[PDB]
Amino acid sequence: KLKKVLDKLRLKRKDISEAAETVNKVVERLLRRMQKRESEFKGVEQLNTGSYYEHVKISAPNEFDVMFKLEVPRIELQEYYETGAFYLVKFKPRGNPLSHFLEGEVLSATKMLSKFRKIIKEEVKEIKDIDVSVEKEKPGSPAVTLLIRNPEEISVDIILALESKGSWPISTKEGLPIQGWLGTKVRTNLRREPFYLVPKNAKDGNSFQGETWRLSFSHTEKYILNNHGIEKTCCESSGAKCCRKECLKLMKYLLEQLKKEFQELDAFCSYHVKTAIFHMWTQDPQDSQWDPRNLSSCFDKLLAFFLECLRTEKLDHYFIPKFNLFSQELIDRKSKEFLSKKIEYERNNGFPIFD
DNA sequence: AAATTGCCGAAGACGAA
DNA sequence: TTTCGTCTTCGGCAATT
Ligand SMILES: [Zn+2]
Numbered sequence: 001k002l003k004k005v006l007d008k009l010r011l012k013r014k015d016i017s018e019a020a021e022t023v024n025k026v027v028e029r030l031l032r033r034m035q036k037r038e039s040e041f042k043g044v045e046q047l048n049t050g051s052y053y054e055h056v057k058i059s060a061p062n063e064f065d066v067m068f069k070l071e072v073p074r075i076e077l078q079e080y081y082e083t084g085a086f087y088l089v090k091f092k093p094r095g096n097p098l099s100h101f102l103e104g105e106v107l108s109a110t111k112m113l114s115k116f117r118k119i120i121k122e123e124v125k126e127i128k129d130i131d132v133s134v135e136k137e138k139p140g141s142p143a144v145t146l147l148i149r150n151p152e153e154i155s156v157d158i159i160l161a162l163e164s165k166g167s168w169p170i171s172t173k174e175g176l177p178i179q180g181w182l183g184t185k186v187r188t189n190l191r192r193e194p195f196y197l198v199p200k201n202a203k204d205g206n207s208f209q210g211e212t213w214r215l216s217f218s219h220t221e222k223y224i225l226n227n228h229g230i231e232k233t234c235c236e237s238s239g240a241k242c243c244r245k246e247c248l249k250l251m252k253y254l255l256e257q258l259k260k261e262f263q264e265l266d267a268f269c270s271y272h273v274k275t276a277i278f279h280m281w282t283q284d285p286q287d288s289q290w291d292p293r294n295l296s297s298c299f300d301k302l303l304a305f306f307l308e309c310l311r312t313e314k315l316d317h318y319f320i321p322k323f324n325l326f327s328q329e330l331i332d333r334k335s336k337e338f339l340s341k342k343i344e345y346e347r348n349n350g351f352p353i354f355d
Numbered sequence: 356a357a358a359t360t361g362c363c364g365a366a367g368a369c370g371a372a
Numbered sequence: 373t374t375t376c377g378t379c380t381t382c383g384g385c386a387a388t389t
Pocket of ligand 1: 229234235240241243244
């Protein structure tokens, strides 16, 4: 049953080729335009992220995430309240290329993202060989979203990010609990990689809204997805397949089908599901606990874990323990009850919504 | 020095044991 | 049933020109 669902969700090579061809054409040209002189984003580099590049994209290759990361040395972070995820960015710098984005010492995400969008929008109108347009700025989004007609609709989220090469913020110190799973050497190496800040970009009118940045660990998540086994040979050609990624695919699919016809399930997203399975992979680190022969039981325990997260209203950010994804803030209690009331129904009735 | 080069892992497609 | 093996393309990474 679940095996058949996965086959339906599996991407087609023909679709992948046609989509990637067009996307790569657009992204590289935009990345190049960003590199020409007199540009404040002259040093930006590309880092592909999200479901497609983690090979957990389902149904169709019609959504692509791309990070345009800017190296920002000499950075000074200030934690926004007791959040742990949200920060203000201060500089310790004379002729700075982003000096016109500064409000005193404070780096404005709104001003920087504005000019970033302006540059992309100008280059997009110069594209004549591809049907591509820039979607209107959406509240809460750190990305300039492209709409491509290939003729099939394709969305490309170009995410502006600040790259810092120093130690990760102290709010992440007790995060990434992969010690008994991927090990201490892997964790230490991962945390020697840079961390990333993206614009939080809310329009609620709250204080600091134009200058609040949020942590992004999309790169770390991507590595983890590609290196997810306790054994080094997991899912390799001389190793054994596990069902970790397919459980994620199935859980992603269950949520999306539910979100389609229920507006109450808004404010829920794939990242909640992704976060949950990361905790699950931590609690069940053995590759033998994720055998393909036990796909049904593996998916069921993921559901049980998720349901318990709803019931207790607690889903800690995998990298930032303080940040509860299921707080009373962000998500109302009525919403968790509703999703819980739709999950067990699907769970008990052999998943009719998969059809 | 901007971007081509060299390599092969991950996984989609097909197919015989 | 499948699934294992082989062939295939896409992507990631840095050495190179
Ligand atoms: Zn695996």
